[PDB]
Design a protein around this nucleic acid. Structure first.
Length: 65
DNA sequence: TATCGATA
DNA sequence: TATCGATA
């Protein structure tokens, strides 16, 4: 309700909805999950999402380009 | 299935 | 200096 894993968020709202929200390509996602990357998403009260993957010690964004 | 441009 | 998402 304020901070979740991708996969989870996935399970809830489906890869499609997710994708759009992140603003990346659907495939981008399942692949991501398929690769099991620690990404988390936050939920701005205004229902706005955002992600960030915990790379190596460092926490980078998502996506990165 | 692999490159390439953007990023940080 | 290297990753990752998009493409074709």
């Amino acid at each position: 309700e304020q901070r979740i894993t991708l996969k989870d968020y996935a399970m809830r709202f489906g890869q499609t909805k997710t994708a759009k929200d992140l603003g990346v390509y659907q495939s981008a996602i399942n692949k991501a999950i398929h690769a099991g990357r620690k990404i988390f998403l936050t939920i701005n009260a205004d229902g706005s999402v955002y992600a960030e993957e915990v790379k190596d010690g460092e926490v980078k964004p998502f996506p990165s380009n």
